[PDB]
Design an enzyme around this catalytic site. Structure first.
Site, PDB file in Angstrom:
ATOM      1  N   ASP A  53       0.851  -1.185   0.000  1.00  0.00           N
ATOM      2  CA  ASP A  53       0.000   0.000   0.000  1.00  0.00           C
ATOM      3  C   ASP A  53       0.890   1.238   0.000  1.00  0.00           C
ATOM      4  O   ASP A  53       1.771   1.380   0.853  1.00  0.00           O
ATOM      5  CB  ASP A  53      -0.933  -0.008   1.208  1.00  0.00           C
ATOM      6  CG  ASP A  53      -1.908   1.154   1.201  1.00  0.00           C
ATOM      7  OD1 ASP A  53      -1.908   1.928   0.221  1.00  0.00           O
ATOM      8  OD2 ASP A  53      -2.674   1.294   2.177  1.00  0.00           O
ATOM      9  N   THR A  86      -3.311   6.152  -4.605  1.00  0.00           N
ATOM     10  CA  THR A  86      -2.187   6.904  -4.057  1.00  0.00           C
ATOM     11  C   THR A  86      -0.887   6.583  -4.782  1.00  0.00           C
ATOM     12  O   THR A  86       0.039   7.403  -4.789  1.00  0.00           O
ATOM     13  CB  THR A  86      -2.038   6.616  -2.564  1.00  0.00           C
ATOM     14  OG1 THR A  86      -1.844   5.209  -2.363  1.00  0.00           O
ATOM     15  CG2 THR A  86      -3.275   7.070  -1.805  1.00  0.00           C
ATOM     16  N   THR A  87      -0.787   5.396  -5.384  1.00  0.00           N
ATOM     17  CA  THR A  87       0.410   5.064  -6.150  1.00  0.00           C
ATOM     18  C   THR A  87       0.424   5.792  -7.489  1.00  0.00           C
ATOM     19  O   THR A  87       1.481   6.249  -7.944  1.00  0.00           O
ATOM     20  CB  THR A  87       0.493   3.552  -6.360  1.00  0.00           C
ATOM     21  OG1 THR A  87       0.481   2.888  -5.091  1.00  0.00           O
ATOM     22  CG2 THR A  87       1.765   3.183  -7.108  1.00  0.00           C
ATOM     23  N   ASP A 389     -13.909   0.889   1.314  1.00  0.00           N
ATOM     24  CA  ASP A 389     -13.569   1.020  -0.101  1.00  0.00           C
ATOM     25  C   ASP A 389     -14.808   1.325  -0.937  1.00  0.00           C
ATOM     26  O   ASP A 389     -14.772   2.183  -1.831  1.00  0.00           O
ATOM     27  CB  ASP A 389     -12.889  -0.256  -0.596  1.00  0.00           C
ATOM     28  CG  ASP A 389     -11.608  -0.562   0.155  1.00  0.00           C
ATOM     29  OD1 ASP A 389     -11.262   0.203   1.079  1.00  0.00           O
ATOM     30  OD2 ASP A 389     -10.948  -1.568  -0.180  1.00  0.00           O
TER      31      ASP A 389
END
Lengths: 521, 528, 517, 41
Positions: A53, A86-87, A389
């Protein structure tokens, strides 16, 4: 040609900042996609954390470079707004930083780079919004399908048919339609040991995490109840300074005992006179939350008692109930209390959860508190994560209605369109737009590399396929190649990509705008 | 004793080391000589930054381990009171004399002969100044007052107060007139108090004919002003030093009340004492009570009931100022107070300056008095400090001018004339006297060269032109362009320096040179 | 070893090197932040847990510690900009740094004390300010609306004051006393007459200048076509202090004769006045009968006890001057006054001045019941006038984009020719320092600073040009057509503060090491 | 005021040459006159 000698070189600061940011971006890049490689970070306390993550990796990396912390800030902003990807934002920031470095090597001033990147980001956002497939919040089917698609990545899949509509209804009860941005943080996930996955409840009002008094005198429920938040405790006089009890006769001891009992009774009577039928006592280790005599007095006064309440629950109820905290019994009045049709403890199969319904208060808002049940702790934890989510996905849909194809298809299409359009531009703007378009292809390249596919071949296949289709073909880990993501039910909210582009643009502008570093103390 | 870490010089490097140290000390303020001298940054150990070109201030705040430098600074500290505005010039002249003495010693001249020759040269220079001096007071009183005001304005103009420096000059002249008589022609600076505070503007300056006594009147309900009572005989002041309280023990006290008898006895004693004191005050006929000590609660209440404003904690010097201004006397005790010893003043009122809200109490006479106070205000601490320094310099210049009618002109003209006279006399005296006179003349030449350098002019050409003008044509007052001037010949520019001031500068420079030269061995121990 | 506590005077060479270079280096902290297109600066704390990024010059200067005393002095002097304007501190610091750099270059080329450099900078700053004033424009159109706003503001300010007796009348008086000046709004241009024998509502407005304490014993009550010169002479009570002086006299008669001779000695100065073509004479001190008769014989009016404030205001309204001596005949500046009348207001004598040369002043007459009422009325009028004066400071703007700065630089360059050679270099240095600002603005905008600066300089030099820097398109455009203007007050304050800061450090020879904190 | 920049430093070389010449002159000086001191080389 020739340039300024620049005996002092502020450009060194920018070079160092770009190098650090690109190193962080490259480190985070390898975790993109379901096939991303796991990262190991050992904390100063000796604990070993392994996870793919981006958020956790960035937090545990303990980035010391002030500029590189812009990536952590971008990830936090993406989590607050989008809740996922976020990546991708970090990868885009790294690609834009590389493009800016290449432009600087060509003799382009950083300010022009920032302005052209802003313009290119605006155009890319417009293009992305053009191709988005719009959906309606009033159509429960589309939201349920999106929630099921999001939940399919979790262990709980066969039960998604219930989790998806649960989150859809929970969000819709507070978002309705045309509500613009809706904050999902007002939705509370209450976990309780017991039951199974299928056991769940939304409660349109507010749900408390503590049980009612199980001892003698506990009503366990009360109709026409007013709920208030109490920060003090019901106990005999307990001065915060030096104090003691001095007895010189039996009569003095009896008088002291009678005074203590009278103080407890007076506190209970003051609570009752305010018409507070539900007592919420904050947890304390110095004063008894509700003394046994106080419990009996409250029971005789027909007051529902709930104790052992933590600060987080009080903060949540401050908005769920719409009431205000009471600093001390002297300030305990009706104005600090809430309202409700009935407050009771629900025990169907061992749930034992206190709920408040029918608040009917202007300050109070329908902060839906979804109840999560499960025999095992893992079941409830996974349900909470999956529902979080799903709520994030539904929030992304609410803020910007519609979904876009996953697998990097929109990135490839936007890159191709921007490259085609930039040919009509002139000056430094054309070069910067071409560099931005080239950098946009980083996401599909990273996805192909992490999937074990031929990096160069995948990009060419996507580009060739996009000449006939539109936002339909992309990289899918299920097929180990390029396929029709839209037909594969691989869809992502458009807001995720839009926010990623915007945050990457803002981060690159901020990084490029720093020209010097100085100490201040 | 304390032999370790002990350093000494004698026989080989003593003279060279002393002269080099003196030159280094002088170079600190050499560039600050003259009205346009460059400023120096002085920073306190707490980090407060100040800017000023005053040589006396620069040297006073400088501490060092060098013995010759320490002696020079200490001598300058004492000389600051004698002249004040001539510290930098005296230091520069002494440094030049020491530099010349270096060469004289290198030629084989004993230091005692150098000192004697310098003394003789100083005598000759003073005689030449006396011969070439002019009298202003003996020419016209109007011109004398004009020159006094011009000197005050010149002193004030170097500071921020130049915008409205006329008021400061007028106040200084009035204070000098009030405090100084022509019997001695000496200004008693002890009777000219300098006081001020941050705030207001340069136009808030005021000259007071008595003590200020900015007191709060102790009790909050005590009246803050003493009115003249609609034409009455001014205000009668009770000058007292005994505290307005009964005697009390110095060990235990704790005179608490436990029963009726003790309450009655203590109240009887205290009330009798307070009543005696207040009745004495009333019989004296004083309108305001002034005590060297504080006041008790009962005393304050009694004074308030009798309409007797109180003044607390007045210093001995303040009491003397009160007596001088009000023509009164200091009464040791209340029992000795009488109407025959009370002072009289026009009024005691609160005066506001600019936007100041303090409403300070001031005792005013409005008549000629032997003691006055120079009140200085300004928008910043630097403004107040500069105004006070300029006022002190103006007072010193006025005192020097009044003391001696003979005056000289600045800009180095007097220095050039003295140098020419000394050079002419040198060839007449044989022996080491010739070398001493030549060295003294060269040292005198330093001052005009330094002034020219500070003004951006070439010292060589400027000095040569001054000498040519003062020798080939006639003896006059021609100096360097210290300030913006149309031409030379300060005589028409009205740049006047008192004769006594220049004589004192020369004498102090010679004395400092002798003091430094007469030390041939220095011993310094270690530090703990 | 000197001084102590790590606070010692540095060598002259190194002291000057610090004073100049370190002070200049302060600009580099804020040079990149000049203009709306400025760059950002990172300030990092020791713990790194409170680091932040800001582009505010004032914040950067006040947050980053400055060990060099010269930087401390420069920042302290430049701080006046925040109180005066509250914005543009970056411009002040940059201009000061450029001026210091140019002065350092000049010193390296002369190796002489910068006093001449200071004088040249003063002259160049005066010329630049004059040019800026000439290049300013007025946005105060529709002065009727401004007058109405002034009336409303005056009425608002007069509330709760003694002047509330006639709110409309006093508001009109206050508004007129500011509007009719047509120039400086300072209180020195407005006179207040405090008299008793009426109500505050009866206050009268007089555009003329009125003084108190009438003059003369045998002088006429009316003066026409007055030629006014003010002097500070002791024409009364000569020899103020004589106590203790020994007089070689046989009786007091000879002492009186000596005093009379001393008084007569002033006859030369009295006669010198007539050689200037003067028919009206004003003296700060009183005038005795003998000098009064001497002036009468010359046909010169004698005004007594003019003090200082009265002298200053009379000279300002009449455009005269005050002197202490008459060195040479026919060399002086004379004021003019068409008519002077002796009047009494409230049983108190007053002097009325009318027809003053280019007189710009107003007078308000107050009729009160006691001292408290008059003092309160005067204070309220002063406050109201101060509040109303704000309208005469706003609406003053100059062309932006460096147009005004380039015009000022051109004016300074023009001044560099009509000056001695030893100061032309300083004037040119000041012009270069002024020109540095548009170069830095162009650099911060990411465009070719040299080309834009050269084009702007050529355009401005080549006559009536209003062009300026186009930081949005990176070219040269007409500021007036685009409406790009900047506050005149801001530019004037920035230039004045930069000049003062440069002067403060130029006059410094050596700097003592600052004590670490 | 403004004077020549004097960017170069010929003063160092000039002073070194002057010092050498003065040293030689001082060495030769003591031989002046009939009573001059003898020099051994």
């Amino acid at each position: 040609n020739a340039t300024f000698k620049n005996k002092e070189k502020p450009q060194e600061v920018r070079k160092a900042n770009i190098i650090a940011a690109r190193s962080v971006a490259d480190a985070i890049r390898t975790s993109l996609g379901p096939k991303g490689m796991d990262k190991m970070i050992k904390t100063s306390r000796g604990e070993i954390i392994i996870s793919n993550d981006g958020h956790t990796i960035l937090k545990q990396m303990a980035i010391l470079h002030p500029v590189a912390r812009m990536l952590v800030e971008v990830s936090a902003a993406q989590d607050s707004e989008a809740g996922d990807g976020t990546t991708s934002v970090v990868i885009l920031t790294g690609a834009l930083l590389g493009a800016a470095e290449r432009l600087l090597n060509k003799g382009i001033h950083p300010t022009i780079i920032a302005d052209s990147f802003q313009s290119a980001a605006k155009r890319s956002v417009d293009i992305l919004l053009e191709m988005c497939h719009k959906v309606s919040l009033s159509d429960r089917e589309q939201l349920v399908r999106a929630a099921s698609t999001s939940l399919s990545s979790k262990i709980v899949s066969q039960y998604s048919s219930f989790l998806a509509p649960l989150a859809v209804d929970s969000v819709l009860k507070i978002s309705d339609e045309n509500s613009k941005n809706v904050d999902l943080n007002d939705i509370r996930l209450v976990k309780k040991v017991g039951g199974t996955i299928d056991d769940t409840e939304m409660i349109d009002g507010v749900v408390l995490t503590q049980t009612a008094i199980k001892s003698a005198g506990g009503p366990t429920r009360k109709e026409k109840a007013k709920i208030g938040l109490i920060q003090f405790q019901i106990s005999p006089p307990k001065p915060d300074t030096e104090n003691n009890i001095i007895v010189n006769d039996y009569r003095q001891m009896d008088k002291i005992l009678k005074e203590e009992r009278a103080y407890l009774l007076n506190i209970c009577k003051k609570i009752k006179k305010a018409k507070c039928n539900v007592l919420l006592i904050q947890k304390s280790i110095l004063r008894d939350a509700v003394n046994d005599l106080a419990l009996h007095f409250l029971s005789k006064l027909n007051i529902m008692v709930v104790k052992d309440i933590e600060r987080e629950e009080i903060e949540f109820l401050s908005k769920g109930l719409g009431c205000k905290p009471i600093a001390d019994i002297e300030l305990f009045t009706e104005d600090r209390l809430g309202s409700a049709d009935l407050v009771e403890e629900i025990d169907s199969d061992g749930s034992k959860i206190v709920r408040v319904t029918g608040i009917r208060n202007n300050n109070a808002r329908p902060t839906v508190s979804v109840v999560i049940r499960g025999a095992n702790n893992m079941i409830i934890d996974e349900t909470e994560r999956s529902l979080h989510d799903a709520l994030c996905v539904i929030r992304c849909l609410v803020k910007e209605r519609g979904l876009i194809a996953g697998g990097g298809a929109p990135e490839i299409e936007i890159s191709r369109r921007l490259s085609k359009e930039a040919r009509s531009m002139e000056g430094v703007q054309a070069f910067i737009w071409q560099e931005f378009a080239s950098a946009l292809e980083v996401i599909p390249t990273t996805l192909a590399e992490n999937a074990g596919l031929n990096s160069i071949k995948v990009v060419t296949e996507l580009r060739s396929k996009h000449e006939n289709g539109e936002l339909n073909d992309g990289i899918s880990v299920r097929r180990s190649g390029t396929t029709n993501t839209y037909e594969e039910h691989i869809l992502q909210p458009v807001l995720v990509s839009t926010s990623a582009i915007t945050l990457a643009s803002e981060c690159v502008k901020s990084i490029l705008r720093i020209d010097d570093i100085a100490f201040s103390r | 004793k304390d032999q370790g870490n002990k350093k000494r010089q004698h026989g080989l490097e003593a003279k060279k080391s002393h002269i080099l140290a003196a030159r280094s000390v002088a170079s600190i303020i050499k560039t600050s000589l003259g009205p346009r001298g460059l400023d120096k940054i002085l920073i306190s150990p707490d980090g407060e930054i100040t800017i000023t070109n005053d040589g006396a201030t620069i040297l006073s705040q400088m501490e060092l381990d060098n013995e010759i430098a320490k002696l020079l600074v200490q001598l300058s500290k004492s000389q600051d009171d004698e002249i004040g505005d001539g510290t930098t010039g005296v230091v520069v002249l002494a440094s030049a004399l020491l530099d010349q003495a270096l060469e004289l010693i290198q030629k084989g001249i004993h230091p005692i002969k150098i000192a004697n020759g310098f003394d003789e040269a100083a005598k000759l220079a003073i005689s030449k100044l006396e011969e070439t001096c002019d009298d202003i007071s003996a020419s016209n009183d109007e011109l004398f007052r004009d020159f006094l005001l011009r000197a005050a304005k010149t002193s004030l103009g170097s500071k921020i107060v130049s915008k409205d420096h006329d008021r400061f000059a007028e106040m200084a002249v009035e204070a000098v007139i009030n405090v100084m008589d022509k019997d001695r022609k000496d200004v008693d600076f002890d009777l000219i108090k300098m006081q001020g505070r941050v705030g207001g503007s340069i136009s808030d300056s005021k000259l007071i004919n008595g003590v200020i006594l900015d007191k709060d009147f102790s009790h909050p309900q005590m009246p803050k002003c003493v009115l003249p009572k609609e034409g009455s005989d001014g205000v009668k002041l009770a000058i007292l030093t005994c505290p307005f309280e009964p005697p009390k023990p110095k060990t235990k006290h704790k005179l608490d009340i436990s029963s009726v008898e003790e309450y009655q006895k203590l109240q009887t004693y205290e009330q009798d004492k307070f009543k005696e004191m207040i009745d004495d005050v009333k019989k004296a006929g004083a309108d305001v009570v002034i005590c060297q000590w504080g006041f008790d609660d009962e005393a304050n209440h009694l004074l308030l009931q009798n309409d007797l404003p109180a003044v607390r904690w007045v210093g001995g010097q303040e009491l003397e100022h009160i007596a001088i201004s009000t023509n009164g006397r200091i009464v040791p005790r209340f029992q000795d107070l009488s109407k025959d010893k009370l002072g009289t003043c026009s009024r005691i009122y609160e005066q506001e300056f600019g936007t100041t809200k303090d409403r300070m109490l001031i005792i005013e006479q409005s008549k000629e008095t032997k003691t006055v106070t120079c009140f200085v205000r300004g928008s910043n601490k630097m403004i107040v400090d500069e105004a006070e320094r300029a006022l002190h310099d103006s007072l010193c210049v006025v005192r020097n001018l009044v003391k001696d009618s003979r005056v000289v002109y600045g800009g180095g003209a007097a220095e050039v004339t003295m140098s020419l006279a000394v050079s002419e006399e040198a060839d007449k005296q044989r022996g080491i006297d010739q070398y001493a006179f030549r060295g003294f003349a060269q040292a005198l030449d330093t001052i005009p060269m330094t002034l020219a350098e500070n003004s951006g002019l070439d010292p060589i050409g400027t000095l040569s032109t001054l000498k040519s003008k003062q020798l080939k044509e006639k003896i006059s007052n021609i100096g360097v362009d210290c300030l913006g001037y149309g031409s030379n010949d300060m005589k028409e520019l009205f740049v006047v320096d008192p004769f006594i001031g220049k004589k004192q500068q020369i004498l102090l420079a010679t004395q400092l040179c002798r003091m430094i030269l007469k030390i041939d061995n220095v011993i310094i121990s270690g530090k703990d | 070893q000197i001084f102590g506590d790590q606070v010692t005077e540095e060598r002259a060479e190194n002291a000057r090197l610090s004073a100049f270079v370190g002070a200049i280096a302060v600009g580099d902290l804020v040079k990149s932040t000049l203009g709306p297109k400025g760059m950002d600066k990172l300030l990092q704390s020791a713990s790194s847990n409170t680091c932040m990024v800001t582009n505010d010059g004032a914040t950067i200067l006040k947050s980053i510690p400055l060990d060099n005393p010269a930087a401390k002095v420069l920042v302290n002097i430049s701080k006046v900009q925040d109180d005066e304007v509250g914005d543009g501190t970056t411009s002040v610091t940059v201009l000061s740094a450029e001026l210091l750099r140019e002065a350092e270059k000049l010193i390296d080329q002369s190796k002489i004390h910068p006093q001449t450099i200071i004088e040249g900078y003063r002259l160049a700053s005066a010329a630049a300010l004059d040019a800026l004033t000439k290049a300013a424009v007025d946005n105060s159109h529709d002065k009727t609306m401004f007058r109405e706003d002034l009336i409303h503001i005056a009425k608002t300010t007069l509330s709760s004051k003694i002047l509330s007796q006639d709110k409309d009348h006093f508001a009109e008086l206050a508004t007129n006393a500011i509007l009719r000046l047509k120039g400086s709004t300072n209180l020195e241009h407005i006179q207040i007459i405090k008299i008793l024998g009426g109500k505050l509502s009866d206050s009268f407005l007089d555009e003329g200048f009125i003084l108190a304490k009438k003059f003369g014993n045998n002088q006429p009550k009316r003066i026409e076509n007055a030629k006014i010169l003010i002097a500070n002479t002791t024409l009364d009570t000569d020899k103020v202090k004589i106590f203790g002086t020994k007089f070689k006299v046989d009786s007091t008669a000879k002492l009186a004769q000596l005093e009379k001779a001393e008084r007569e000695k002033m006859k030369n100065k009295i006669a010198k006045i007539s050689k200037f073509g003067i028919n009206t004479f004003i003296n700060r001190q009183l005038i005795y009968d003998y000098p009064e008769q001497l002036f009468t014989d010359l046909g010169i009016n004698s005004i007594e006890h003019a003090d200082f404030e009265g002298v200053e205001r009379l000279a300002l309204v009449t455009g005269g001057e005050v002197v202490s001596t008459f060195d040479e005949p026919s060399k002086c500046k004379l004021g003019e006054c068409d008519v002077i009348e002796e009047i009494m207001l409230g049983e108190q004598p007053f002097l009325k001045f009318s027809g003053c040369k280019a007189g710009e002043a107003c007078t308000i007459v107050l009729r009160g019941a006691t001292d408290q009422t008059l003092d309160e009325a005067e204070r309220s009028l002063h406050d109201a006038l101060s509040v109303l004066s704000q309208t005469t400071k706003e609406t003053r703007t100059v062309l932006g984009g460096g147009c005004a700065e380039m015009v000022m630089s051109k004016a300074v360059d023009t001044e560099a020719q009509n000056i001695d050679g030893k100061k032309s270099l300083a004037v040119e240095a000041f012009a270069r320092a002024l020109r540095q600002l548009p170069t830095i603005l162009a650099d911060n905008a990411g465009f070719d600073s040299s080309e834009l600066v050269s084009k702007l300089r050529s355009s401005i030099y080549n006559g009536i040009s209003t062009s300026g820097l186009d930081l949005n398109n990176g070219t040269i455009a007409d500021m007036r057509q685009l409406g790009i203007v900047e506050s005149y007050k801001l530019k004037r304050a920035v230039v004045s503060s930069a000049s003062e800061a440069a002067e403060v450090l130029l006059r410094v020879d050596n700097i003592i090491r600052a004590r670490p904190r």
